[model samples]
Target: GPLGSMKTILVKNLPSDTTQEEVLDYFSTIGPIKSVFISEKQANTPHKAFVTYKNEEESKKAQKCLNKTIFKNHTIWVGPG
Candidate 1:
């Protein structure tokens, strides 16, 4: 079966200056966002944010298109949460 359960995805290596609203706005392009959380810091990296979508389809799209994608001049990692 394809990826199932949960509509939350994890994003990493975001720009240090990234904000919650920024994450929200970014992922919103793929689909409606349920919620977003940005971490304070993460060992010289920002692989520390979580984004939940209204549907699994959107989550999957985010992972497919956003993973290893560049944002704010930095590459980010995306995966299932």
Candidate 2:
């Protein structure tokens, strides 16, 4: 790995009912997705999704502007991974 590492975004505080399709679409608006890992839902926890942007370094900038945005009646926090 020449550049040495790849980073991801950790999405939290999303509604417990958030779906995989919804996570994908929201991240898409920020930028192209490198990939996405959506965790299965649980009874006492909100679903979690990790999103990676396609532009590599440009994603760092994109992540900064994409936190605590409202979606599905909840505000999700997007943070660096």
lDDT, candidates in the order shown: 0.85, 0.71
Please give, for residues 1-81, the per-residue lDDT of candidate 2 as tens digits: 234135577787777666667777887876777677777766787667787777656457656777877876787877766
Models 1 onward score TM values of: 0.84, 0.72
Pairs in steric clash, model 2: none
Off by over 4 Å in 2: 1-5, 41-46
Q: Can you list the residue pairs that collide in candidate 1? A: 12-47, 13-47
Number of the top-ranking candidate, with TM-score as the measure: 1
For candidate 2, give the lDDT: 0.71
Candidate 2: lDDT of 49?
74
TM-score, candidate 1, is: 0.84
Residue 27 alpha-carbon offset, candidate 1, angstroms: 0.6
Error of 1 at 64 (Å): 0.1
